[PDB]
Amino acid sequence: TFKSAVKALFDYKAQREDELTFTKSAIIQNVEKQDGGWWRGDYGGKKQLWFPSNYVEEMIN
């Protein structure tokens, strides 16, 4: 039952090989939250890739 989803508020184009690309309104799943400005998660056929946390809204459970 444990969910960790976020909703993109802004588009983001991956700048490094291990980064996620997504568009606004995307639901990014299984998110690990770290406090250095970078989180990782699953979207668009990508698994556990990195994205900047200031691009998203946490979907509280």
Protein backbone atom coordinates (compact mmCIF):
# COMPACT_ATOMS: atom_id res chain seq x y z
CA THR A 1 0.00 0.00 0.00
CA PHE A 2 2.91 2.47 0.46
CA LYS A 3 2.89 5.11 -2.29
CA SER A 4 5.45 7.80 -3.09
CA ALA A 5 4.14 9.73 -6.07
CA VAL A 6 4.73 13.28 -7.23
CA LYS A 7 3.09 15.39 -9.92
CA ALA A 8 5.26 17.44 -12.27
CA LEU A 9 4.45 21.15 -12.12
CA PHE A 10 6.98 22.02 -14.86
CA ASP A 11 8.55 20.25 -17.80
CA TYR A 12 12.07 18.87 -17.35
CA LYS A 13 14.52 17.71 -20.01
CA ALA A 14 17.22 15.30 -18.78
CA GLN A 15 20.68 16.93 -18.79
CA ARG A 16 22.62 13.86 -17.62
CA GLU A 17 22.34 10.22 -18.66
CA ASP A 18 20.77 9.11 -15.37
CA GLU A 19 18.07 11.84 -15.34
CA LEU A 20 14.38 11.67 -16.05
CA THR A 21 12.58 13.61 -18.79
CA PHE A 22 8.96 14.53 -18.18
CA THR A 23 6.24 17.04 -18.89
CA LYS A 24 3.99 19.04 -16.62
CA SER A 25 1.16 16.94 -15.13
CA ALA A 26 3.16 13.69 -15.32
CA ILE A 27 2.85 11.32 -12.36
CA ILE A 28 6.27 10.13 -11.25
CA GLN A 29 6.15 7.02 -9.08
CA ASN A 30 8.17 5.16 -6.45
CA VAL A 31 10.00 8.33 -5.60
CA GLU A 32 13.00 8.38 -3.27
CA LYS A 33 13.31 11.80 -1.68
CA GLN A 34 16.74 13.20 -0.79
CA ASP A 35 17.57 16.69 0.49
CA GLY A 36 20.21 17.75 -2.05
CA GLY A 37 17.65 19.00 -4.59
CA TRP A 38 17.51 15.68 -6.48
CA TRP A 39 14.94 12.89 -6.16
CA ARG A 40 14.65 9.70 -8.22
CA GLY A 41 11.61 7.87 -9.56
CA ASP A 42 9.78 6.09 -12.33
CA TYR A 43 8.07 7.61 -15.36
CA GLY A 44 7.69 7.04 -19.08
CA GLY A 45 9.42 3.67 -19.19
CA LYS A 46 12.37 4.92 -17.11
CA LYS A 47 13.26 3.33 -13.77
CA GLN A 48 14.74 5.21 -10.79
CA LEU A 49 16.17 8.15 -12.74
CA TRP A 50 16.98 11.52 -11.16
CA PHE A 51 15.08 14.79 -11.35
CA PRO A 52 15.19 18.13 -9.53
CA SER A 53 12.73 18.21 -6.64
CA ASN A 54 11.72 21.83 -7.28
CA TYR A 55 9.93 20.71 -10.46
CA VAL A 56 7.23 18.68 -8.66
CA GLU A 57 4.38 18.64 -6.14
CA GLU A 58 4.28 15.85 -3.56
CA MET A 59 0.99 13.96 -3.67
CA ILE A 60 0.35 13.39 0.00
CA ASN A 61 -1.32 10.02 0.72
